[model samples]
Target: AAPNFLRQIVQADLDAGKHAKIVTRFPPEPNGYLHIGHAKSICLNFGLAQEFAGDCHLRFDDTNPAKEDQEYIDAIEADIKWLGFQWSGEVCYASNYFDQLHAWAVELIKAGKAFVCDLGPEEMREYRGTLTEPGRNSPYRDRSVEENLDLFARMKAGEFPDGARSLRAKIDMGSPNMNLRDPILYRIRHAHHHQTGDKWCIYPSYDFTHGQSDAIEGITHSICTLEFEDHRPLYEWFLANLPVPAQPRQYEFSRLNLNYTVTSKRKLKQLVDEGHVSGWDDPRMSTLSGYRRRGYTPESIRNFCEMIGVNRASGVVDIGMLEFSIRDHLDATAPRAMCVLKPLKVVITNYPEGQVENLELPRHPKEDMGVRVLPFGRELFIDAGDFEEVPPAGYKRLIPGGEVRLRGSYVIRADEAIKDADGNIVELRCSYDPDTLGKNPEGRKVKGVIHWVPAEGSVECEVRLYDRLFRSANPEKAEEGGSFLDNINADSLQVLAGCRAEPSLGQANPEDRFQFEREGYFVADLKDSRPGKPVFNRTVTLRDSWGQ
Candidate 1:
């Protein structure tokens, strides 16, 4: 919004009266669930429409029925709406213009600008030369208009098997732009379409259908990712050659690429199909649904998109930027609570037996977010990592004969370590100073304050510790001639089934988020959570490790 190249260009257009209103669109090929990469484009297009007082259409480029699905279509629509943007009106699909596209193909044939080519896949590749060489003409380039029209009609009527024949534009075979080398306009497919059913067998290629569909919808600015920059010329050539309703210009921007995450639909589908992850909505996945399920707010994701901004240079962003955005939001708004993952039992030996003190703690340290009452009893549970039998240099937490403040309670000193037969420390024998409640004792220092939950009153639940899916920063390229799974973080997800939380957490519903004091931000699992029993997923850490 702050004078980016795209905003500047649009403003200039408006100033010159090039167009009365701005019209942009977010067109996704509904072959997979929408991911964070799509979120950037959605924000750009829809944000532009809102900023310019125009309209943005949500269009599905449902041209490839072999892979596209109605389920993905439904998910995409929900994702966009969840991100807080409304489309202009009814959702549009490229399939809506199948009849018009077929007519235009006929018109091209009548004008000798197109022909039916019988080249198979291997033959077409041979004819389509590499960048160093120009493509040779197809053998069927000289087919007469009458023969081509009849063959095309039969192809549409399902007379031809899949990939037996294709309608190609009559363009230069020697053009430097490979896309202009008589690209396929339509191909024979025997599969049934989700939208049009079995009405026709010949489906239009995305390259041929997208520009025309944009023209049909009167799209003012056809925005696309940088991968399509080379295809823009071919896109304009169709509008130039065909009698389209209106011409639309295409603009390209760098896509959102984050380290430690893969956005390719092929790789994501493989991950799900091969059981590398729970599903597309797995907390560790980079999908929008995954982020939502991981307790990421739509506001945080949208802010991240704006923070990254739109640019022409393609680059990889540090995943910590996304982490920081979510942490910033959760730190301010998410209610503070305590959960002991990998619980260590602490018995207060000197405290009065069977005593339970209700201690009220602020929900947030800086904000006026009310408070939560925590029960303090003779027995409590703390994180296993909070205490040490042998303290490291400068270690301030609980150690043998050392004192530490029990958050929202009293200062406690570790008197003895209770060990099992295997020499593993299972619990700590501690004594709480009655006078040390809410303050440090005279001539003493208890700098470390660790969170804890009452062993009796706390709710025991599953706490999933989620980390980056890929161990390597560039997981896709981490292994040479290997699958991305080779770089998967084996410890990406660690489930703590015996974790204890404050009593208020028992009321948390699915997607309810909270800050686990010193641990991190977490959310109730949307799929597995139930009343009185909940499963929480770690959203992110407390610190931004990438940078400030």
Candidate 2:
């Protein structure tokens, strides 16, 4: 849609009157949750279809039922809708063409282009040969058409045990491309399929199903990732050999690879299975569900995907680009609120006790976002990080005998610190300048402004501070003998139970997002948060902290 290679190809095809309309598809294997990597492909396929006034099908390459679940299928559909997209028609599945695929397999056998092979998987691989060496033809490659047909039919009828026999295309065994070297077209599996049930024991391979499915759906451009480029010849081989209704050409683009995260479903499942995270929706995870739970807006994620653009060049995108998109969106839209994490109690010794004042603060700094009333009293809570007993060089925040401005309120100076028996700072004795409520002090400057909430009327809630899941920029590129798990950040998530927020924030509903003034952007937990008792999840920090 944005003048990418695929868009140009579709445009040229349309200009040449190749067809009345273009047809695109987003075919996902329903084995796991959709992640950020999938979002790029989704936006590309759907975006093209919408821009071209064509239809984009939501087809599930649900060929591998053993690894897939209804749960994942449901989650995938929900995620797509959540991203503000709707499929063109009824949901499509690869399993929908099981009977037709079986008939095509029989046609291949009848034409002597396919044969039932008894070679085991390992034996077949050994026969497949390396790039440097030519493969030897399978001894069972040249079986009679009738014999191959009978074996394939029986195999479908469950006469053979799992992996006992497989339907392999009788292609050139000596082909340089490994995928063209007599690839298996169908395999015997005794397991039950989620969609087709136990009606058939033989299932078509993904390679065999993918192109044929595209052809069946009348797909004009079978767009895919770069990894599938080598498999295109084999994909076309079936289209040429079979009586498919339409000719669909497969095109490949580089996949979205973000540093500091792994996109592989195998690795993601390992993180879940090993309990490295709370679940698939853990805020630190890269899964879409995780992003949603972590308070990411659909607009931000879609914008991020579009900003990266579609291309053939392969490279790793810095994860900060994604953070930038979210921060940019939230900064412009999310209302301002105050939440003090790691609270430091401050007692205004100069102010009268039991005196309460309602201070009106703008909900957004530079927008007409209205206002919220914040209670100002003698006792207040500020961030523990805002106070420094021993100020560092160039430190601007509150320190002993130095004045600092309270956000949306008065300028205050720390008189002294109160400690517990363990010498831990439990409280601070402070004095607030009454004249500095709406303006700066006379003839002096207080450069540091710290956010605070009145201790008496503030609502205490749980705040989860989420960081990058992996410590290293390239997590999968771990040291030799070390897996990606070795690079897991031990401090990826830090939860504070005693976090205090303004009274207005207590009414925030789940999924309501806000910027916590000087803290960062946050969202009320969609699942765990309740009205008047919201659980806040830090969407991101105020600025990019990585690679700094």
Candidate 3:
């Protein structure tokens, strides 16, 4: 659900006939990957469109040709489509309106509202004074309309090098707002645009192009993140002067912020470019691609976005909430399977050495498609974590002479144990009660149930157990005398090479999701996985370890 204020804004707009039907756009700069914050905007734009029976546009604000690339455009489109949103007709790119934007710039110059400024970066910043005082106008601000138009046209024709000249609106320098102080509309960038190619050298700035593009597309409501709230006046100014299509209104709301990770594009780029992360899709990274590769479902993300709701207030949301959403959806939808991470051989001393038996097991016990036959054998593997050398407070699982039920099978009692030279509990000698086939007829109840898979008959695969990349709740708050990377959780990814999984999981497709009975939700690697030999990555555990 969204805030009541947003609802009122919609209702009031409908009443005023500002638009016959609401039209919104998810305009992303195709220079970086879409993170959770972008997911919020995607949901807001697409969700609002669905609410009013209107259309939402999937637009790439690929105005800056310097850093923009086709890969980013493709990813942005894919991410939005994966979220289950369909834009009206063909997808829109700011480059699509290049000719018109250029014309509007010339129109502004002809009307004496804009001029070509040769001020360097430092001088421009100095002229644009602080918030407390009025700015000093640029020397080029008073250029005649004829001279400005000739310079602007020549600049667009690639006659000028980058930073040699810029086209700026002849706005007030004494206005209280710094953005009103003759903001540069276009800059000379010789770089080739992804869509438009090298047709023009002068490119429009985001502040100049965004509102005009929205107006040209007949957008009713131009929604933006809170960062742009201060720049609303600039968007309005562009709309006020430019002869655009439908009257576009700008609305700003708080952007989504999540804990434990930084969300800025610049910061994310640094992580990737610096090789801190594998890439944008690295499982540990916060990019949408990373989440997808790590087995996060779109439904889970949508549900989370809904649960968090759209708030106007700015706050950092707990990452636990996002993790909880995945676990919650998985608990209900994912099938259950047995997996032994950090396994120790447990030889059933009573069973025949060469004997291999097929035992019934449940994919999901309470689910409609309940049980399946999993192979069982004389030798089995159990989690080393399930056993304790010396049972202490609250440790109810396994110890010498202690009996625990093998989940969905038999009651096993540890009669003896084996230790490695270093005194690590390497193996266990356990005995199972044959009489406890499905249940104990004597009605005896063990305090714990543990998952097991036949050692010889099961397939072994690499299971990557991932934890938070950063140890601190706010990794940015690394201790004194420490860098941000110093806070990196060194044990973030623990790879268990010889992990054993149930026989049924052998043929599991990459499409399959499994609740590793008592372990956590897991999915096979989408890219590196094969039919029978798949690598499973733990999506998230059954509980929130971060909170713990």
Top TM-score prediction, candidate number: 2
Candidate 1, superposed: residue stretches over 4 Å from native? 1-3, 17-19, 478-482, 545-548
Better of 2 and 3 by lDDT: 2
TM-score for every candidate vs. truth? 0.94, 0.95, 0.94
Model 3: lDDT of residue 137: 86
Scored by CA lDDT, what does every candidate get?
0.90, 0.90, 0.85
Model 1, global lDDT = 0.90
Give the lDDT of residue 402 in candidate 3: 87
State the lDDT of candidate 1 residue by residue for 1-548, as single tens digits: 22356888888987887767888999988877889988999999999999999999999888776545778888998999899999998899999999999999999999999999999899999999977898999999999999999999999888978899999999988998989999999998888788888887889988999899999999999999899999998999999999999999999999888888899889998999999899999998999999999889998998888888888997888888889899999988899999988789999998788888899999889989888888887899988888898888888789899899988889999999999999988989899899987767988888698999999879999999988888888888855667888999998899888899988898889989999988899999989999999899999989864452
What is the lDDT ranking, best to worst? 2, 1, 3
Score residue 378 of candidate 1 by CA lDDT.
Answer: 83
lDDT of 3 by residue, 1-548 (tens): 54634556888977887768888999988887889788989888998888888989988888887544778888988888888878887889998888999999999999999999999999888888889978998998899999998998899888878899999998899998878889889998888778877887878888888999999899988898788888999888888888887788988888887878777777677778998777888788888888888888999898888888876789878889899989998898888889888788998889878877678776765778667667666789999989887888887788899888888888888988988899887789988888887877376668888998988767899998877777876777767797677777888788889889888888888857889988898989888789898899889988877783
Counting clashing residue pairs in each candidate, in order, gives 0, 0, 0
* Superposition error at 136 for model 2 (Å): 2.2
